[PDB]
């Protein structure tokens, strides 16, 4: 009775309306002029649509907050969603719950969701949005600031619109070692970072069944890599097919290289960078060449003794420096039709050559018909 | 009774703001404001957090319908303070229904989120309004508020909400266009023709017909998937097309363009040349066999609309039997690097995905093709 009045007061203050603007549902009640309706059964309140005339009377109110009156029908649940007027249910996806209204939210570990499908919706204990219908229209829809933060943080850019149309993920096509948390100071060992970056472009196994297998990997999507800092690495890097490597500008024999790759192995009887050539094993399989002195010959290709796995490789301005004493800078083996521009090998460390950061042999190349090196340094 | 109603109301206000019941005061002329955290207006039935620093002894003088409170020590716009604390009221109704806003912390709901009015109050909103049609969005106008608004703003923006280093915003540095922006499938199966065309058109929308010769900004396109298309693509002036690397006798193309027309007596790709009509107007050439002569370019029978075009590493695949791969006609000073035409499909050239004629070029003085394959 007066619990009614104090409740209308509580409801009114929650919605920012007047006490007189809250009406309790009951069959026959005049809905005219009220701003909020209260269901005394479910103990939920809902903003009412504007434009209910005097003398329009309530007929029914479902547990999904569908209101029927003498003049028509309205889904108060959807209206509430449009107004961001939500109820966050007790519990979580992990506890399980049952949802009855469009404006009910269920908490997950990464934020809240509303259910956009058939109501009522039962959620079992130990559930996730993925295991209970997935996300998207007609299913779970992410709601609220906490959810937005985590979606942005873990997303791919699809939430960010760009011009003239589309979204950010549509135009991000370049990889950097910084995506892999490379330190890039020429001091830390960034080897594993660089290898994962390359492997994420094209991950070819070091051992393969037959010839069809090794050739299957030149048929992969090509990706551009941007190197903007200085990466120390300690093991030979094998460039897989379909890689384009890029640096802003070429080094012209500068003293302290601050952008590029610094090869610093324990074993100096090696190459910094090599293309991929697979060599036939006794059993008929093929293993990726790791031998520093090996290079394929036209004969080797024809015999089947070697299969090249170096197609669609492009270098633009790569600076490669090397610890003093390293045998070979770049092994351009099997690189038919592959191209290079502004490839710089060796550092002008200073006057003493025995202490300079440059290889004994700069570049070793075979089986590379139709390859082009521009502005090689 | 009344005093009871006042205590229970203070209780409801206090629960809403998370303060103590004793910390809520009703506005009345002369009330001491010291120590209270929230003020309630009986008339409008609105509550507002009070600024800290109101001294005991400071008394209320007036409180307007815009929530401007005047007291004995000064004045404060409670609506403005509420905005800073993200304490709003979402008005009944919507832009559709129309409304009147009186306070700075009132939000009006629109289909894509909520907005507050940052201009002169009160603000009347006619039924059937939109923020854009009633003052636009920005300082002194409609300001978007809340998570629903932020989501739609981000989703439909250009990146101007996202700061980048060393300064500026994301939109300042986005200089690459892509078929994925137009929702191209890029599987080499779906027909991506209209998508590619819209992409090119958005860069330079040269009509197929031009009134006179006088009638007849450059942008970089990145192609990273495999797009099947079914009608000749006409490359407009001012286009730079790029792919990460070029193919070289590649067996299965998984990156580039695949021309798969019903009518095979056509070109996959063509530059634009306009030919003079008997009435003096010009029409884009669409004849596969046509090429402009130097003389044509001189006597105006043909007008070149192919300057500033660059191609890096484009791979072009063609259904077997297609007449021409690329028509480089009128491409004076235009450049190409690693253009690859034709697929090494298999031993039977009859079924290979390559054209009868790879490249046809005329009127392209000063043109350079590097590592053409
Ligand atoms: Zn409340």
Q: How far apart are CA A191 and CA A306, in angstroms?
A: 27
Q: How far apart are CA B234 and CA B327, in angstroms?
A: 10
Per DSSP, the residues of A269-281 read SSEEEEE-EEEE-
Spatial CA neighbour of A107 closest among A123, A120, A118: A123
Q: How far apart are CA A249 and CA A45, in angstroms?
A: 64
Per DSSP, the residues of B280-318 read S-EEE---TT----HHHHHHTSEEEE--SEEEES-EEEE
CB burial readout B127-146, b (16+ within 10 A) else e: eebebeebbeeeeebbbbbb
Spatial CA neighbour of A13 closest among B308, B13, B130: B13
Q: Are the Cβ atoms of B252 and A48 closer than 8 angstroms? A: no
Segment A345-354 long-range contacts (CB within 8 Å, at least 24 positions apart): A345/A320, A345/A377, A346/A320, A346/A321, A346/A322, A347/A254, A347/A255, A347/A256, A347/A257, A347/A321, A347/A322, A348/A253, A348/A254, A348/A255, A349/A255, A350/A255, A354/A324
Strand partners, A36: A22, A47
- Residue B313 token pair: 């590493």
> With contacts defined as CB-CB under 8 Å, which chain B residues touch A221?
224-225, 254-255
Cα end-to-end distance, chain B, whole Å: 93
Give the structural domain span for A89: 85-155
Distance from Cα B129 to the centre of ligand 1, integer Å: 29
> With contacts defined as CB-CB under 8 Å, which chain A residues touch B13?
13
Spatial CA neighbour of B61 closest among B39, B35, B81: B39
Q: Which of B109, B180, B255 sits opposite A82 (nearest CB)?
A: B109
Q: How far apart are CA A105 and CA A144, in angstroms?
A: 10
Residues near A130 by beta carbon (within 8 Å), at least 6 away in sequence: none
Counted across chains A and B, CB pairs separated by less than 8 A come out at 163
Q: How far apart are CA B213 and CA A139, in angstroms?
A: 57
Q: Are A134 and A66 within one domain?
A: no
Q: How far apart are CA A61 and CA A55, in angstroms?
A: 17
CB burial readout B192-211, b (16+ within 10 A) else e: bbebbebbbeebbebeeebe
Distance from Cα A14 to the centre of ligand 1, integer Å: 4
Q: Can you say which residues of A are annotated as belonging to the binding site for Zn(2+)?
A: 14
Neighbours of A337 (CB within 10 A): 23
CATH number of this structure's domain B1-86: 3.30.2020.50
Q: How far is B279 from chain A (nearest CA, A)?
A: 37
Q: Which of B16, B222, B373 sits opposite A14 (nearest CB)?
A: B16
Distance from Cα A117 to the centre of ligand 1, integer Å: 28
Q: Are the Cβ atoms of B254 and A82 closer than 8 angstroms? A: no
For residues B125 and B100, the answer to whether their CB atoms sit within 8 Å is yes
Unique residue bearing structure tokens 């309630």:
B40
Distance from Cα B24 to the centre of ligand 1, integer Å: 14
Distance from Cα B13 to the centre of ligand 1, integer Å: 8
Neighbours of B269 (CB within 10 A): 24
For residues B226 and B253, the answer to whether their CB atoms sit within 8 Å is yes
Q: Are the Cβ atoms of B45 and A10 closer than 8 angstroms? A: no
Unique residue bearing structure tokens 């956009």:
A116
Q: Which of A15, A312, A339 sits opposite B247 (nearest CB)?
A: A312
Q: Are the Cβ atoms of A14 and B162 closer than 8 angstroms? A: no
CB burial readout A208-222, b (16+ within 10 A) else e: beeeebbbebbbbeb
Give the domain CATH number at A26.
3.30.2020.50
Q: Are A101 and A67 within one domain?
A: no
The architecture in CATH of the region B87-157 reads Ribbon (2.10)
- Residue A22 token pair: 């809250």
Q: Are A146 and A116 within one domain?
A: yes
Spatial CA neighbour of A276 closest among A245, A311, A315: A311
Q: Which of B109, B174, B243 sits opposite A162 (nearest CB)?
A: B174
Spatial CA neighbour of B337 closest among B236, B228, B245, B249: B245
Q: How far apart are CA A124 and CA A142, in angstroms?
A: 19
Q: Are the Cβ atoms of B46 and A16 closer than 8 angstroms? A: yes
- Indicate the SS3 state at residue A229: coil
By C-alpha distance, the chain B residue nearest A9 is B9
Q: Are A137 and A61 within one domain?
A: no
Q: Are A89 and A70 within one domain?
A: no
Q: How far apart are CA B114 and CA B106, in angstroms?
A: 10
Q: Experimental method for this entry?
A: X-ray
Q: Which helix (H) or strand (E) holds B241?
A: strand B239-242
CA distance to A218, B316, B325, B343, per residue, from B254 (Å) = 10, 11, 18, 11
The answer on whether B16 is annotated among ligand-binding residues is yes
> With contacts defined as CB-CB under 8 Å, which chain B residues touch A224?
244
Q: How far is B36 from chain A (nearest CA, A)?
A: 18
Alpha helix stretches (DSSP H) within chain B: 2-17, 78-84, 147-156, 193-203, 294-299
B181 burial type by CB count under 10 A (0-12 exposed, 13-18 middle, 19+ buried): buried
Which residue in A83, A239, A244, A307 has the most chain B C-beta atoms within 10 A of its own C-beta, making it the best mutation to test that interface? A83
Q: Which of B222, B248, B255 sits opposite A337 (nearest CB)?
A: B248
- Residue B172 token pair: 């300042």
- Phi, psi (rounded to 5 degrees) for B32: -70, 135
Q: Which helix (H) or strand (E) holds A64?
A: none
């Amino acid at each position: 009775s007066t619990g009614i009045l104090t409740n209308k007061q509580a409801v009114a203050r929650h919605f920012g309306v007047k006490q007189s603007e809250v009406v309790y549902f009951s069959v026959g009640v005049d809905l005219g002029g009220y701003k909020v309706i209260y269901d005394k059964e479910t103990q939920r309140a809902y903003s009412l649509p504007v434009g209910i005339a005097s003398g329009t009377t309530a007929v029914s109110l479902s547990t999904a907050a569908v209101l029927v009156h003498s003049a028509g029908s309205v889904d108060l649940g959807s209206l509430a969603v449009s107004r961001e007027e939500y109820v966050t249910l007790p519990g979580s996806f992990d506890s399980g719950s049952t949802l009855n209204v469009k404006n009910e939210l269920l908490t997950y570990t990464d934020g809240k969701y509303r259910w956009d499908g058939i109501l009522p919706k039962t959620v079992a204990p130990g559930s996730t949005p993925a295991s209970t219908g997935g996300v998207g229209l007609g299913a779970w829809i992410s709601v609220g600031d906490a959810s937005l933060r985590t979606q942005l943080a873990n997303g791919d850019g699809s939430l960010i619109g760009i011009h003239p149309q589309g979204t950010l993920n549509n135009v991000l096509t370049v990889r950097t070692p910084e995506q892999y948390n490379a330190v890039g100071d020429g001091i830390a060992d960034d080897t594993s970072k660089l290898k994962e970056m390359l492997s994420d472009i094209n991950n070819v196994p070091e051992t393969l069944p037959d010839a069809a297998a090794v050739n299957s990997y030149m048929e992969q999507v090509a990706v551009k890599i941007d190197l903007t800092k200085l990466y120390r690495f300690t093991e030979t890097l094998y460039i897989p097919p379909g890689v384009s490597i890029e640096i802003p500008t070429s080094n012209f024999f500068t003293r302290e290289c601050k952008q590029g790759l610094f090869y610093d192995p324990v074993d100096k009887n090696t190459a910094a960078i090599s293309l991929m050539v697979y060599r036939k094993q006794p059993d008929g399989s093929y293993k990726l060449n790791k031998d520093v002195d090996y290079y394929p010959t036209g004969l080797d290709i024809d015999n089947g003794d070697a299969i090249t796995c170096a197609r669609k490789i492009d270098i633009n301005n790569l600076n490669l420096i090397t610890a003093p004493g390293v045998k070979v800078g770049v092994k351009w083996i099997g690189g038919a039709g592959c191209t290079t521009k502004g490839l710089s090998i060796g550092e002008n460390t200073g006057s003493d050559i025995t202490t300079a950061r440059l290889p004994r042999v700069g570049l070793l190349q075979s089986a590379s018909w139709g390859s082009i090196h521009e502005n090689l340094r | 009774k009344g005093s009871t109603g006042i205590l229970t109301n203070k209780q409801a206000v206090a629960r809403h703001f998370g303060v103590k019941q004793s910390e809520v005061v009703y506005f009345s002329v002369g009330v001491d404001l010291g120590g209270y955290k929230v003020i309630y207006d009986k008339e409008t039935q609105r509550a507002y957090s009070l600024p800290v620093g109101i001294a005991s002894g400071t008394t209320a003088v007036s409180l307007s319908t815009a929530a401007v409170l005047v007291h004995s020590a000064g004045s404060v716009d409670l609506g403005s303070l509420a905005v800073s604390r993200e304490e709003y009221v979402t008005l009944p109704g919507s832009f559709d229904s129309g409304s009147t806003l009186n306070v700075k912390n009132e939000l009006l709901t629109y289909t894509d989120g909520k907005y507050r009015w940052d201009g002169i109050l009160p603000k009347t909103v006619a039924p059937g309004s939109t923020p854009a049609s009633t003052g636009g969005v920005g300082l002194g106008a409609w300001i978007s508020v809340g998570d629903a608004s932020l989501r739609t703003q981000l989703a439909n923006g250009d990146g101007s909400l996202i700061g980048i280093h060393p300064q500026g915003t994301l939109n300042n540095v986005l200089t690459v266009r892509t078929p994925e922006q137009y929702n191209a499938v890029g599987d080499g199966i779906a027909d991506d023709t209209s998508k590619l065309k819209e992409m090119l058109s958005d860069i330079n929308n040269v009509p197929e017909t031009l009134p006179d010769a006088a009638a007849v900004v450059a942008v970089k396109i990145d192609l990273t998937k495999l797009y099947r298309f079914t009608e000749t693509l006409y490359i407009p002036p001012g286009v730079s097309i790029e792919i990460p690397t070029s193919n070289f006798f590649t067996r299965e193309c998984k990156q580039g363009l695949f021309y798969d027309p019903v009518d095979k007596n056509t070109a996959a790709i063509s530059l634009m040349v306009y030919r003079k009509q008997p009435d003096g107007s010009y029409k884009l050439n669409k004849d596969v066999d046509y090429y402009p002569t130097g003389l044509d370019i001189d006597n105006g029978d043909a007008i070149t609309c192919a300057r500033k075009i660059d191609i890096n590493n484009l791979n072009l695949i063609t259904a077997p039997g297609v007449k021409v791969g690329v028509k480089w006609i009128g491409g004076a000073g235009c450049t190409t690097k690693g253009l690859s035409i034709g697929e090494n499909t298999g031993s039977d050239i009859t079924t290979a995905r390559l054209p009868r004629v790879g490249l046809l070029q005329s009127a392209s003085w000063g043109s350079i093709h590097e590592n053409l394959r």
